Amino acid sequence: GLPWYRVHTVVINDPGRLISVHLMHTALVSGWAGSMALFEISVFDPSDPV
C-alpha cells in the first residue's frame, strides 16, 4: 500500500511508460504555451505602442 507522495515510483523500472509520461508532460507544457499565447493575443491592445 503506497503512500500518496510516492505514487510515481511505479515507473522507476518501466522505461516505455517513462517516455509516455515525459511525452504527456511535454504536451501539457505546450498546451499552456498555446493557450497563454491565444489568451494574451485576445487581451492585447496594439492601439498605441508609444
Ligand X SMILES: CC1=C(/C=C/C(C)=C/C=C/C(C)=C/C=C/C=C(C)/C=C/C=C(C)/C=C/C2=C(C)CCCC2(C)C)C(C)(C)CCC1
Residues that bind ligand X (CB under 6 A): 28, 31-32, 35
Q: Does 28 bind ligand CLA (CB under 6 A)?
A: yes
Count of residues touching other proteins (by CB under 8 A): 3
CA 49 to chain CA centroid, Å, is 32
Q: How far apart (Å, rounded) are the C-alpha atoms in residues 40 and 44?
A: 6
Q: How far apart (Å, rounded) are the C-alpha atoms in residues 24 and 7?
A: 17
Residue 9 interacting entry, from other proteins, ligand X, ligand CLA, none, C-beta within 5 to 8 Å by type: ligand CLA
Q: Does 49 bind other proteins (CB under 8 A)?
A: yes
